[PDB]
Design a protein around this ligand. Structure first.
Ligand SMILES: [Sm+3]
Ligand SMILES: [Sm+3]
Ligand SMILES: [Sm+3]
Ligand SMILES: [Sm+3]
Ligand SMILES: [Sm+3]
Ligand SMILES: [Sm+3]
Lengths: 145, 145, 145
């Protein structure tokens, strides 16, 4: 109805404001319709997935050049690598999102995937490029909502 | 209308995201439709009520086993007891919510209510159990929204 | 429809809750429909405008006695002066909001506008009164959303 249009405006305004506050505080990064955020912790892959899901989100994963630079900037800011939301399929060499879908956008550091042993997980360098690796290292936890 | 369904979806998405960010940062705890939060201050009862109301909320009070454990976890995290949103009625022994209603859910430490003198307020131990007491101690301020 | 009224209620509730959390944490100040917030940085005027706009807001500017005291309180809290969202028009003596409109509400410290040289910007004293000045000083960044 009439009052309906009104209320919707106020709500939109408020959400924008709170999103502005968290942005200014640097506690979140908005890219398109994805929101990236970190609590500053550096734990292993399994642990990170828990944190994100516990918070209502998911371990972060870039699907576009812009989302990738957004996550890299957080990594750069904390001077630590980031574990991305993806693991290697059954047939080595290929990676898939946790939902099971196979990865589309990639940004491997020249030569990767390449490595010592299994290397089923993916870490992001502070420059944004990816490197496959083990899942037991301590990496900055970054989630997407 | 049509565009209406759309806008409602975006709004819901955004709220969820911001709520996810505050959860990940550990600045809030969501339980059912209640949100618990603390600013880390340790002040007396009167002071706590002011803080909560000033922030648009109310001094926290558990009404279910789950809300109780949620508040205890915050108490445990800060290693301090929490003053709950309740005071003793006119007739000693009984407690009521600040709205005037008489308490339903309780989780007294074995023996409580029991104590030295008046003990009109209620503090929560780090294990979740309650103990009645004075209202002038310095306790962690926790609010519910 | 029916379910519509329901969803609107939940949304309003959630927004209120998150706004309560940011208020309790002291990360934002709500005055009427304006939200003021600071990241604690002390940079020059140009830099401040960037921060605010980058966060989806604008450099703060009081338009009522209440908004003015709200900003002063933040200034008082950080013990630093605040650059306001306004610059001097083409004809010295008069100031305008960044949108181009000429200022309405003012709260100059007795004697101001008055000063050394150009003084095209406006800083707020910790008591709330304004003083015109250069735009290259390091002042607390405060944004409005
Ligand atoms: Sm490798
Ligand atoms: Sm492999
Ligand atoms: Sm007792
Ligand atoms: Sm008694
Ligand atoms: Sm001056
Ligand atoms: Sm001048």
């Amino acid at each position: 109805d009439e009052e309906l249009q009104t209320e919707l405006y106020e709500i939109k305004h408020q959400i924008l404001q709170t999103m502005g506050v968290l942005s200014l505080q640097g506690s979140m990064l908005s890219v398109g319709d994805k929101v990236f955020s970190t609590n500053g912790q550096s734990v292993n892959f399994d642990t990170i997935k828990e944190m994100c899901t516990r918070a209502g989100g998911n371990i972060a994963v870039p699907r576009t050049p812009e989302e990738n630079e957004a996550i890299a900037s957080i990594a750069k800011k904390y001077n630590n690598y980031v574990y991305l939301g993806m693991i290697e399929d059954q047939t080595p060499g290929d990676f898939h999102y946790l939902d099971g879908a196979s990865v589309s956008y990639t940004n491997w550091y020249p030569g990767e995937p390449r490595g010592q042993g299994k290397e089923k997980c993916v870490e992001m360098y502070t420059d944004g490029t990816w490197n496959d690796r083990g899942c037991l290292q301590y990496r900055l936890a970054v989630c997407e909502f």
